[PDB]
Structures are given as structure tokens and as C-alpha cells.
């Protein structure tokens, strides 16, 4: 046991590589949560958006159709 | 044959009398005939207006259900 | 005075001419107005039919502009 | 000099206790990342569903506009 010391070095080393891998690996995976969490609020807000158009042509179409019928129905 | 005259006299009175029933009986007819033509000229005049305004109604009507497909069609 | 028969028999005749002249007319008018009357009852039923025809027309379009508002409300 | 060792070990105390400290920072917010990702999955296919709804509706209330064209224009 005359090189106590060259076993702690050569441990530390791997654990040092163990480590930064590790880094590596949860940023990249970071980066990529972070990059598809903001192509998430991008589609969410169009679809918002989307949804209330839609929403006031139907009201707008709404008061269309009620004039119509007021129209029609002087008729009968 | 010594009264052709009293019997010319007494036909003459009957066809004098057939003749003012005559004129009676045509004139009442003509009077009705008339009364109820006036009558029939305010029916079709009515009418008439009547069938205008209903088709002006249409129109509108028409135009209402354009625009409402417009604005729905849009949303398509 | 020895014509008088003379003067009443050529009264007659102008009597007789004026009734039968009377006749021709007064009937000529009668066909024109029965004639103008049937054609008046063909207009007037004509227009009631086609009243009649618009009216249902009127209320088939209520029931559609009616769907289309439930169809319409449901997405308000 | 006579404790090099010491301040090695010291040294590597500390570092030992930064990467742990860095280790639950990281997988803390990865956490927090994914479960807002799940959440907007959730938003995103909500939101389609919604706009795939509407527009169906809107087909329908086209087909009974176009109908009820149809009726009104017999009319005209």
C-alpha cells in the first residue's frame, strides 16, 4: 500500500470525468426543454388568438342572422 | 170588330208596363255589376301592393343571409 | 185632325227603335261587365294563391335562419 | 508545507459540496421544466380540440345560411 495516494488520484480523476459529463448531459437537456417550452408559448398564444377571431365572427354572425330574421318575420 | 183600337190600347199598356219592369230589373243588375267591380278593383290593388312589399321584403332578407355568409365563411 | 191614327202609329215606330236601340246597348254593356267581372275573379284568386305561396315560402326561411342561430349560439 | 494533504482534502470538502449544491439545483429545475412542459401539452391539445370544434360549427352554420338561401331566393 505504498501508493495510497496514486489510487485517491486516479478515483478522482474518473469521478471528475463522471461529473462533467454529467453537466454536458443536464444543459444540453436544458437547453432543449427551454428551446421547446418557448415553441410551446408561441403555438399556445397563436391558438388564443386563433380561438378569440373565431369567437367575435360568430358574433358577428350572430347579429347578422337575428337581422335576417327580424326582416323575415315582419313578413309572416 | 168595332174596338181594334181598345185592343190595341190594352196591348200597348202591357208592353209599356214589360218594358219599364225591363228597365227596372237591367238597371238594379248594371248598378250591382258595377258596385262590385269597384269592389274587385280595391281587392287587386291590395293585393297587388301587397305581393310589392313582400318581395321587397325578400330582397332584404336576401341580402341579410349574403352578408351573414360572408362573415361565416371567412371563418372557414 | 183626320191623321191622328196616322201620328200616334208613327210615334210607335220611333218608340220601338229607341227601346230596341236601348236593348243593344244595355245588354252589350252587361256582357262587357261579366266579362271584365270573370276576368277579375282570375286575377284576384291568382294573386291569393301567390300571397298564400310567399307566406309559407316566408315561414320555411324563418325555420332555417332559426337553425342556423342555434347552430351559431352553440358556439358563442 | 508539512499539511499539503490537508488542504487537498479541504479543497476537495468544498468542491464535493458545490457539484451536490449544483446537482439539486439542476434536477430541480428540471423538474420544474417538465412539469410545465405536461402542463402545456395538456393547453396545446385543449386549444386544438377547441378550434377543431368551432370550425365544424361553422361548416354547419354555413350549410343552414345556404339553405335557407335557397328558400328565400325561390321567393325572388
Given amino acids: 500500500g505504498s501508493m495510497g495516494l496514486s489510487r485517491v488520484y486516479s478515483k478522482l480523476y474518473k469521478e471528475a470525468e463522471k461529473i462533467k459529463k454529467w ?3 443536464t ?12 415553441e410551446n408559448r ?13 369567437q367575435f365572427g360568430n358574433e358577428k ?3 347578422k342572422l337575428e337581422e335576417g330574421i327580424q326582416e323575415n318575420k315582419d313578413l309572416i
Same sequence: chains 1, 2, 3, 4.
Fill in 23 to 25: 453537466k454536458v448531459s
Fill in 27 to 38: 444543459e444540453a437537456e436544458l437547453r432543449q426543454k427551454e428551446s421547446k417550452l418557448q
Fill in 42 to 54: 408561441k403555438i399556445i398564444e397563436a391558438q388564443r388568438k386563433a380561438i378569440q377571431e373565431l
Fill in 61 to 63: 354572425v350572430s347579429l
